[PDB]
């Protein structure tokens, strides 16, 4: 698991997050990685 945990400038009508990924060249399979988006307390 990893969590990122992230605070914006300001408050705001977040439309979307955009996550993007590079995985290794050397990859044989795509890995079975669950993504989610979650508020902090």
């Known amino acids: 698991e990893h ?3 992230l ?3 300001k ?3 977040v439309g979307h997050v955009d996550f993007k ?3 290794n060249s ?3 399979n ?4 669950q993504v ?6």
């Open 36 to 41: 989610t988006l979650l508020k902090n307390k």
């Open 11 to 13: 408050a705001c009508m």
């Open 21 to 23: 990924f590079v995985l």
């Open 30 to 33: 795509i890995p079975q990685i």
């Open 26 to 28: 050397n990859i044989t």
């Open 3 to 5: 969590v990122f945990e």
């Open 7 to 9: 605070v914006l400038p």
